[PDB]
Amino acid sequence: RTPLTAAATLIVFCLVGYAIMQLTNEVRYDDVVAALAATGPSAILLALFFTALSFLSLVFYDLNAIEYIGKKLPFPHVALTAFSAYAVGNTAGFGALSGGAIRYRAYTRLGLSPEDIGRIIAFVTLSFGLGLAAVASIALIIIASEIGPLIGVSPFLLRLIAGSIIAILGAVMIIGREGRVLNFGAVAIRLPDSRTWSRQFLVTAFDIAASASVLYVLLPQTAIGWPVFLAVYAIAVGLGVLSHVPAGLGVFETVIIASLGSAVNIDAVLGSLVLYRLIYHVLPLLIAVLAVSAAELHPAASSVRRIGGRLMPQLLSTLALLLGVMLVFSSVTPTPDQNLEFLSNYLPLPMVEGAHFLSSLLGLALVVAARGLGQRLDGAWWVAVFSAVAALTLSLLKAIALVEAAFLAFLIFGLFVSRRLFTRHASLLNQAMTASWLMAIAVIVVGAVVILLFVYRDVEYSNELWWQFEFTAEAPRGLRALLGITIISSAIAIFSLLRPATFRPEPATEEALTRAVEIVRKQGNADANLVRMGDKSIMFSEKGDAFIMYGRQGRSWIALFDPVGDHGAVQELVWRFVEAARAAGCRAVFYQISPALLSHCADAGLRAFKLGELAVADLRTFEMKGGKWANLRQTASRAQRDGLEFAVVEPENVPDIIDELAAVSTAWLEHHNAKEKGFSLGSFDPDYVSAQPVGILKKDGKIVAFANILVTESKEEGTIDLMRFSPDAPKGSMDFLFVQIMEYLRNQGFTHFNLGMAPLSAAPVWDRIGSTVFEHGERFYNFKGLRAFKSKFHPHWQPRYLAVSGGGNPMIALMDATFLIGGGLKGVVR
Amino acid sequence: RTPLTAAATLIVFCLVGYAIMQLTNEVRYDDVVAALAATGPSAILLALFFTALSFLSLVFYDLNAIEYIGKKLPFPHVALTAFSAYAVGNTAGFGALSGGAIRYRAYTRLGLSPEDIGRIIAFVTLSFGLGLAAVASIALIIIASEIGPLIGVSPFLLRLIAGSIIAILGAVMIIGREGRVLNFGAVAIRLPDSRTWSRQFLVTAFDIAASASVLYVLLPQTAIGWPVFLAVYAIAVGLGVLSHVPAGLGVFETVIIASLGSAVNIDAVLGSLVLYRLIYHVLPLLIAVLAVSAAELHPAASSVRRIGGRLMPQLLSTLALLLGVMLVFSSVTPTPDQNLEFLSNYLPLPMVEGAHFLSSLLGLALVVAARGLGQRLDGAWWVAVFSAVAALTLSLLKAIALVEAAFLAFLIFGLFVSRRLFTRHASLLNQAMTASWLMAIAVIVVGAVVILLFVYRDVEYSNELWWQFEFTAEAPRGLRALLGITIISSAIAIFSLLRPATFRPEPATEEALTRAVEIVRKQGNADANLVRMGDKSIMFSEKGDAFIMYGRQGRSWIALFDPVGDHGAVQELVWRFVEAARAAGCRAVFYQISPALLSHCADAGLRAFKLGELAVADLRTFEMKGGKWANLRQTASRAQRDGLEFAVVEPENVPDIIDELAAVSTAWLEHHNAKEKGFSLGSFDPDYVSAQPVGILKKDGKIVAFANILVTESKEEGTIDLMRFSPDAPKGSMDFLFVQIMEYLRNQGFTHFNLGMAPLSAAPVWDRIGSTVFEHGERFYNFKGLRAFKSKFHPHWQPRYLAVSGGGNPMIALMDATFLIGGGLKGVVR
Numbered sequence A, B: 001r002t003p004l005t006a007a008a009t010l011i012v013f014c015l016v017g018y019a020i021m022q023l024t025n026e027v028r029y030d031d032v033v034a035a036l037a038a039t040g041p042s043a044i045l046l047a048l049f050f051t052a053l054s055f056l057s058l059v060f061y062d063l064n065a066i067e068y069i070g071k072k073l074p075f076p077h078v079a080l081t082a083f084s085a086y087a088v089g090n091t092a093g094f095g096a097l098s099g100g101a102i103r104y105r106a107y108t109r110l111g112l113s114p115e116d117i118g119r120i121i122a123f124v125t126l127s128f129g130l131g132l133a134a135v136a137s138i139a140l141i142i143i144a145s146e147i148g149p150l151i152g153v154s155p156f157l158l159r160l161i162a163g164s165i166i167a168i169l170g171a172v173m174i175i176g177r178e179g180r181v182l183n184f185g186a187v188a189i190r191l192p193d194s195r196t197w198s199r200q201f202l203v204t205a206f207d208i209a210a211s212a213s214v215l216y217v218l219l220p221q222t223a224i225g226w227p228v229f230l231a232v233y234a235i236a237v238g239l240g241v242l243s244h245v246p247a248g249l250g251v252f253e254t255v256i257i258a259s260l261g262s263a264v265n266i267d268a269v270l271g272s273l274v275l276y277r278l279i280y281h282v283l284p285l286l287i288a289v290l291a292v293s294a295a296e297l298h299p300a301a302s303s304v305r306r307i308g309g310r311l312m313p314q315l316l317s318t319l320a321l322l323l324g325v326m327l328v329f330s331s332v333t334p335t336p337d338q339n340l341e342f343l344s345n346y347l348p349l350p351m352v353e354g355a356h357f358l359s360s361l362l363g364l365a366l367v368v369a370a371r372g373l374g375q376r377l378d379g380a381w382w383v384a385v386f387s388a389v390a391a392l393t394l395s396l397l398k399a400i401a402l403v404e405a406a407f408l409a410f411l412i413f414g415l416f417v418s419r420r421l422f423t424r425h426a427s428l429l430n431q432a433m434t435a436s437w438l439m440a441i442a443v444i445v446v447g448a449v450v451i452l453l454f455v456y457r458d459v460e461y462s463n464e465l466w467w468q469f470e471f472t473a474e475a476p477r478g479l480r481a482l483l484g485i486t487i488i489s490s491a492i493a494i495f496s497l498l499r500p501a502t503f504r505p506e507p508a509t510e511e512a513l514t515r516a517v518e519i520v521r522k523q524g525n526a527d528a529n530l531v532r533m534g535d536k537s538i539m540f541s542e543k544g545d546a547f548i549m550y551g552r553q554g555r556s557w558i559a560l561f562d563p564v565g566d567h568g569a570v571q572e573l574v575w576r577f578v579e580a581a582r583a584a585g586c587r588a589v590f591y592q593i594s595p596a597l598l599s600h601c602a603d604a605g606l607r608a609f610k611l612g613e614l615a616v617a618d619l620r621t622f623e624m625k626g627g628k629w630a631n632l633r634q635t636a637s638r639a640q641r642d643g644l645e646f647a648v649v650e651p652e653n654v655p656d657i658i659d660e661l662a663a664v665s666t667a668w669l670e671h672h673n674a675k676e677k678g679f680s681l682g683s684f685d686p687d688y689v690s691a692q693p694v695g696i697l698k699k700d701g702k703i704v705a706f707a708n709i710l711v712t713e714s715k716e717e718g719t720i721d722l723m724r725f726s727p728d729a730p731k732g733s734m735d736f737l738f739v740q741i742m743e744y745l746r747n748q749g750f751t752h753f754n755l756g757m758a759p760l761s762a763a764p765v766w767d768r769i770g771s772t773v774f775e776h777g778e779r780f781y782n783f784k785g786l787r788a789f790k791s792k793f794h795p796h797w798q799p800r801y802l803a804v805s806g807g808g809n810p811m812i813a814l815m816d817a818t819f820l821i822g823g824g825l826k827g828v829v830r
Ligand SMILES: CCCCCCCC/C=C/CCCCCCCC(=O)O[C@H](COC(=O)CCCCCCCCCCCCCCC)COP(=O)(O)OC[C@H](O)COC(=O)[C@@H](N)CCCCN
Pocket: A054, A086, A089, A090, A091, A093, A099, A124, A125, A126, A128, A129, A130, A132, A133, A136, A153, A161, A207, A208, A211, A234, A235, A237, A238, A239, A241, A242, A247, A248, A766
C-alpha cells in the first residue's frame, strides 16, 4: 500500500545515509570543494556533450514506442515531450512529476488516445527495465575478472549471478515469443517482436553508455576503465530505481562510492558525483524551462509554445522542488570565510543569522509551492514567487551566494513569463499532502542531516553550540536551520495525517434534484435522467445551467457520465470537482466519460482507462423494411405469432400499472438470482419508475416485460434504464421491445437511441488493469443484452473511460465504483 | 582482374610471412608444443562451447536474410545450409568453396529463386562487413586507453581513426535511410530498415564475441582482458578478410602476435592460435561431414540426407584441401624423437625417408583432388581415395602419426559413404586450374617454407643437408619434401598457364544443321528454329535426340535458349557442355534459360541472374471479339481503313518476294540507323529467310512489313524472329501484323504465341549487376515492341536467366554475349 511503500523507501534512504557517512569517514567538505575546482573545462564540456547525447537517445525511446503502436507523430513535438518526461522523471518520479504523468498530459494534447498513451508508457518503462538489466548483466559477465577485485567479490560468483539474470531474461524472451502473454499474477506481459526489441535495446544501450560517460569524464583517475565503470554505473542506476528514492539520491552515490572507493580518491568521486547531479539532472530541466519561457516571450517558437503551455507547470514544479532542495542543503553547508568577513566589515551579525534561518525555511516553502505549481494554483504561484524573490535577496545577505541568486532568478523569470497558466483559486494548505510528497520532504530533511554530519564531522557537539552566535559560527547556524526545517516539516506531515474532511458529502436535496432535472430536459444526453434516482450528490456551475452528479465511497469521489448542461460550463465544473474532491482528502474519479471530456480531464491531472463502448443507433436511417434489418423485422412478426403487444405508458398512468410492474421486476431479480444496483443503474423505486414514461410488453392481456424510457425535450437521444422480463416472456421479447421503442422514438423525431454499455471485444507491453476492467464490464454491462445482441442494430461504438486523479493504481478507483453500483448508499426510496 | 588480385594476395601473404618470422625470432617449435600440452580440459571444453555458440549465431544470419526477403523456409534446412556455408567459407572462400557458392547450390534445392538467393548472399556479406567494422571501431573507441600502450600507438589517434570510421558508417546509414540507393560507381547499395539492421547487428556482435571467446579461453594470461582482446580479434578477422588469403591464414596470426606480443608469451599465443584453427576451422567441417555421412549410412537423418547429398562434394572438397595442407605442413614439421627410435629399432632407414617424401607429395595430390571433388568427377574421387589410403599407411611408417591417420580415415569414410555423388567422367588434369586455386597452392607452399624456417631456425644450412640421410635427420628430410612440393606445384602452375585449347570450337556442318532442325520440328520450343541461321556450333546428346547450340567469344562458351529435344537428355547435356567448356579453358554460359533448367545448372555449379521475361500468349482463349481485347480488335479495323492486307507466304514461294523483303529489311536498318545482329537474333540472310514461312503486310499492292514465323510440327508454340516495317508503314501496322499472325496460329491449332523478351519492370542490399543487365535488355529486347506493347495481349510473364560457370563476375559473361549478338562470327551467309 502507498504508505507502506513510502516508509520502506525512507528506511532504505536512512540505511544508505548510515552507509555513505561510514564510507566517507576520512573525507572533509574542503577536499570535495578542491576536487570541484580541479575539474577542467575539457571535462565539463565533454560532460555537457554526453548529457546532450543521452537526451537525444531518450527522444528515440518515445519515437520507437509510437512506431510500435503504429501512430506517426511530428518529431519536434515527440522530441519536446520525451525531453520534458525524462528531465522531470530523472529528477523526481513521484506522482505528477513522473515521466508517465508528463507523457499522459503532453500526448493527450497531441491527440493520442488514453490506451495509445498507456501502451507508450508500458513500452518505454519495460524497455528501460529489461535494457538496464541486460546491459548490467552482460557488462558484469564480461568484466567479472576486473570488477571482482575492486568490490572484493569472487569473479566466479559474479559471473554466476550475472549469468543467472541473463538466463532468466533469455527465458522470458523465448517464452514471450510471437506475442505469447506471460502472466506474473494480475500483471500480463506481452513483449514486442525481436526486431522492435532489438532496435530498442541498441537505443537503451546508447543512452546508458552516454550517461555513464558523463560521470566518467568528470572523475579524474586511470585505475578503473570505461567497461568496469559502465557495469558499476548501470547497477547503481538500477538499484536507485528499485529503491524508489527520488533520483536515487543516496542509493546511486553509495553504490558508486562503495564500488570505486578502493581505486579512486573518495573526495574526487564525491566532487564528480556533485557535478554529475548538476549537469545530468539540474541542467536539462533548467534548459527545458528556459526554452519554453523564451518561446512564450518562428516554427521552433510555435512548437515549443504549444507543448510548453501544456507542460510548463510540471517543469516549474520540478524547478521549484530542486531550488527548495538547494536552499535547505545550502543552509547545512559552509559558506566561504572570504564572503563572511566581507559581510563582517559591512552588515551586522544579527541579520546574517536571520537571513540563514529564513533561507532554510523558504526552501521548505518552495517544496510545498512545488506540489501547488503542479495543480496550476494561483496561491501556489504567489507563494513560489514571494519565496524565490525573498531567497534571492536573503542568500546574498547570508553568504553573497551569487549562483543561488542566479538559479532563483531563472525560477522568477519562468514564473512571471507563464503567470496565465496558474488561475485555479483552490487553497494550497487545504489541499493536504500525499505519501509520495511526505517521502520527498523526509528524504530532503534526512539528506540535510547527513550533509551537516559530513560537513561538520570534526566539530565536537555541545549544548553551547545551540546558543552560539558569531559571524564565523557556521555549524551552530546550520544546526539551528536543521531544527527549523525539522519542526516545520513535522508540522506539515502531522497536518496532512490529521486533516479533517467534514465527514462525507451532502445528499440530493428535493429543491436541488428538481433544478438538475430541468437542466437535463433542455440538453441532449438522455442518461443524465439518472439524477432523478436521487442516490447521487449534485454540484452546479456558478451560473446554474450545468451540474455534476457524483457518489462518495471510501477515499474516492466518483462522478457519473460527464458534466450535464451548457457546454461552456464543463471546463470550470471538471476543475471544480477535482479541487473539491482534493479538499475533502478524496481522489476524483469520472466513471464512463466520453472522448469530448478527456482533454479537460487531462489538464486537471487525470488518467483515462477505456471501460467499454456505448452502442448508439442513428434512428433517422433505422429502416426496418430494408434488407439490412430483415431479422429485426422477422422477430417482430415472431412476437406477433406469440401475440405480443407494445405500448408507451405516459408518467401519470404509471401508477395504474405499478403493482404489475413490481411483480415483473422481482420475478426477474430472483430468476437471475440478483439484487438491485445503484449509481450508474436505476433500481425499482416506485417514485423513480413514476417520474418517466414506461415501455410495456403484454401477452394474454398481462404485462410480461417493461423498460423506463429516458428522453429530453431536444429529441437528440433516447435510452432505457431498467428493462425486465417475467420468466415466461417468450423468446424474441427483447428484439420486439427494442425494435418498437426505437420506431416510436424514430417517428416522434428523436435522432439517436443509446443501447447502453458493452464490454471490450493493442494490449500494453505490460498491464495490470485489463483483467480488472474485463471482470467489471461483464458484471454490469450485460443486463440489457450482450454485445452480439446490440451489434444486430448496426450501432456506432463510441468508447467510454474511467478518469482517475491519484496516480497510485487505476484499480483502487474502480473497486470504490464497484461498491457504489453493487451496494453503495440506499438513497431516496419509496 | 582475377590474376592481378591473386598476385596481390600472394605479395601480402609473403610480407606477413616475413613479419611472423620476425615477430617469432626468439620462439622455438618445442616451446609451442609444450604450450599445446599445457592447455587444460576446461579451456578446450569452453572453446568447443564457444565454437558451438558462434555456429548457432551464424544460422541466425541466414534466417534473418530469409525474413528480409519475405520467404519463410524450414529451420532444420536453413540451419544445415548456413552451417555448411560458414564451415566451408571460413576455411576457404575461393571459387566454389565460398559461402555464396554453398548458398546458391543448397538454396536452389530448397526452391528459392536465383534473385532471392542473390539478395540473401548480399544481406549476409554486408551484415558481416558493416557489423565487423562497427564492432571493431566501437570496441577501439571504448578501450583506446588500454590497447594504445599494448600496440604502442597514441590512445588519442586510435580514438580519431576509430571515431572517423564510426562517422562514415553513421553517414552511410543516415544517407541510406528509407531505402535510398547509395551508388559507389557500378555498386548500388540500399541498406535495410533500422529494425532489421538492429537485430542483425546484435547477431553479428554475438557471433564475433563467441569466436573471440574461443581464442580467449585457449590463451593462458591475465594481462589483456576480454574487451581489448575483442577489439584486436575483430581487427585481425577484418584484415584477414580484406587480404583475401584463404581463412586469413597468416594475416590473422600476425595481427594477433604483433598486438598481444608485448603482454603475452608468444609461444603460448602461437599454441592458442594452433588450437583456435583446429577447434573453430577444422572441427565444424569434420562435424558437417560426419553428420551427412551418418545420414547417408529418422526426421533428422531425412533432413541432413537431402541437403548433404547436395552439399557433400563441397564439404569433401574442403576436407581434402585441409588434409592436403595437413600432409604438407606435417612434412616440414618435426616428428617426436620417441617415435623415430621406435621406427629405428624395427623398420630400415630408406623406408622412413621414402614415406616422408611421398606423404608430402600426396598432400599436394589431395589439394588437386579437392578442386575435382567440387566438380563431382569420378577420377577426382579415385585419386582422392588412393591418396588418403596411401597417406594413412605412409604416415604411420614415417612418424607413427595416429592423429593424421585418424583424419585421413574420416576422409576415406566420407568418400566411400557418398561414392554415388561422383559420376562425371571429365578428366581432372585436362580441366586445368583457376587463379584462385593457384593462389591457394602458392600460400600452402609459402606456409610450408615459413613453417620450416621457424621450426629449424637454429640449424645451420649446408649443401651437405641436402644429401644427409639419418633416422634423426628431420631438417634434411623437410628441406627435401619442400623441394618436392615446390617443383610439383611449379609444374601444375606452368601447365595451367600454357594449357592448349585446340584453337576455337568447330562451326555448324551442313549435315549437322539438318539433324538439329529435324529434332527442333518434333519438340515444343519454337525459338529452337534459330539453329537454322547456322551461326551457332551444335553438340548432340549420345542417343542423338537432343542438342545444345552455342557460340565462342574470348574466354566464354555461350549456349542459346536451353537444351533442345528429348527432356531425358537435358541433365546429361547441361553437364557435358559445362565440362567441355572447362576442357577448352572457357567459362560455360547459358543465355536466356527457363526456370526448368535452373536446378540442373545449379548442380553443374552455375549461378543464374534474371535477364528479363518472355511474354507468352495463350492462343486457346485469345478471343478478339471479347471486350478484354477490344482495342486490338479496333486497330485491325484501323488497319483496314489504311487498307492493310495480311498473308502467310509458305517457304517455297518466299523466293518470289525475297527482292521486296530485302528492300523493306535495309529500309528498316538505316531508318533505325542500326546493323544486323547474330546468335539470339536472326539477320536477313536469303537462305535463312527462305527456310521458314513469312507473314507479310501489304498496302497499295506492295509489301510494307514482314516477319519470319518459327513453328514446330507439335503445335505447342509459335514465335517470330525478324519483324521489319518500311518507314511508310502506317500506325497500327504491328498491332495488325501480330493480331493476324496469332489468329492464323490460333485456328490451325497452335496453343501458345511467344512475343519474345522484354526487360525488367526486391533489389539486393548491395548489387553490381542491375545497371549492367538493364543497359543490355533495352539494347536487344525492344526491336519487336516495348514491354507496354506486349502487355496489351495479356501474356504470361516467365523470367529467363543468364547462368554463368566462373564465379569471378556475372558481367564478364554478358559482355562476351553482347559481342556474340552485336558483332560475333559472320556464320553461313548467302
Ligand atoms: C554479493 C551480491 C552481488 C550484487 C550484484 C548484483 C547485480 C544486480 C544488478 C542489478 C540491475 C537491476 C536493473 C533493474 C532495473 C529496474 C528498472 C525498471 O523496472 O524500470 C523503471 C522502474 O520500474 C519500477 O517501478 C521498478 C519495479 C520493480 C520490478 C522489476 C524488477 C525486476 C527487473 C526487471 C525489470 C522489468 C520491468 C519493470 C516493470 C515495469 C521504470 O522506468 P522509468 O520510466 O521510471 O525510467 C527511469 C528513469 O527515467 C531513469 O532513471 C533515473 O532515475 C535516472 N537517474 C537514470 C539515469 C540514466 C538515464 N539514461
